């Protein structure tokens, strides 16, 4: 029942310090039997381990990143954190927090610890950029058995955005398309819900657009066309 | 000397849903009879090394014992999940102690199947650490009431392992002993030599 | 530290068995536990094997892991392959110096039927035109295999500028989606009778048309 939730700034400038936090629920970060670590994945590439820690303070580091890394625990917030100094474009990645399989001793007294990840977080996307956040502009995509209606989420930076419909009450027939990366370097995406044509007079449809890096939340009502 | 022979060499072992606990206190514990044995299939210690136990003192030792199948032994570990950890026998995340298992096919399988060993398959919530549930209420899996009988989406919550000596090892019976090493703000009463 | 080498890509039919290898470049593969992580596109990795051969609860029993000291490789065997198993798979081990990840294997499940794309085309909203912008939105979904070409028309003339089209991406349901956006000035939108999004898939064209209100 362990759940891990990353939080990050979405953006960091080259040469500045990246700070990420992982909030744990369904378990205590002060447990002596586990390590807690960070793994990252650059766009379209493989996994890389960064570091792991346990509350007693023993820490392990990827030797290639070690000199730029700090990792720490905050028991009263049930959190652990990552600091990565002097970031470059190479540090653009999705960062995952994770809890390791538990440490143990075998019958011969050999100690096994920090050897693999058991429970993974959701990931937080980090983009290294000179630019600040840009929040989206949201436009309705009006419908004319079934009808397709949607929301256009235009010109935001960086990734990601999330879209829900009717505050999470409408999930059937929802398709949020992967974003386009524009030549400008901004993103746009669309979310479309397929609904019965007969609902369109009486059922209200609202898209709920979240862009955490700009702290933007936008609700847009999508109303049928009437020619 | 602490009575670890009575636990490990008991002729009968509990079903996991009705797991046995023996409190061990006020005695000298020779753990070498365990860690010098090559007879165990699993021997994993959390927060303590077995090669140090003869040098250590605890307030109490608890010995919990039961039978599960081979591919469920991995559930008897901190942070694990599955039908055994969730609904039958739960270690705490902070567990300090040893999990010791061995194959018991020769004792606990029967031609035609031994159906005496049960586990809980259904429960409304997960067990807390070291909680025991021996209730046999009909489990409501759907939205219609059970009126205390099996029926539409209403199931008896315990299921038999049915151990046959010819099963694959993952489906053979394993006897498990969990030793908990407890440190309270109170005098030590269980010490190594 | 050592390398773990995996095949980049593998394909197999549903119901069959696939085995993915993970070869350790130096020191014994048996010296250190090997894990396997499954990752679907856009999703966190999940652990399917740990300590070489142990399966987490919730992992189907047709996932198994093993070690071959002979080739110095770990293996993940997926028996009874399901379309749900399409994913990237990473092996991972370690020694006293550091963790090591394999480079990942992309598994494709063969035999999926040809599916023509569904195309939805939206004209500019009155709100966007009020903001002096005009985006046509061409949403392409449920196609297999995962390649389309998109052509836009102004009346019957080809559109040569203002088009941005995504790479196809695997949906939940193992078919593919893509989107194409055409940016116009309000004058370009109002000055043509219609615009069209033409989607070609496996030599067949699906077209939608929109026009000013
Ligand atoms: C349970 O019974 C077995 C078998 O009688 C015990 O095993 C022996 O233990 C001593 C160590 O004290 C060894 O020197 C003998 O060689 C063992 N005999 C065999 C046949 O293996 C075992 O120790 C008992 N378990 C406990 C916890 O006391």
Author numbering:
A (entry chain H): 1 to 35, 35A, 35B, 36 to 82, 82A, 82B, 82C, 83 to 100, ...
B (entry chain A): 335 to 527
C (entry chain L): 1 to 26, 27A, 27B, 28 to 66, 66A, 66B, 67 to 210
What's written in the study?
Here, we report the isolation of three mAbs that broadly neutralize sarbecoviruses. All three antibodies recognized epitopes within the receptor binding domain (RBD) and inhibited the binding of soluble human angiotensin converting enzyme 2 (ACE2) receptor to the S protein. All three antibodies recognized a region on the inner side of RBD that is hidden in the RBD-down conformation. Thus, they can only recognize RBD in the up conformation.
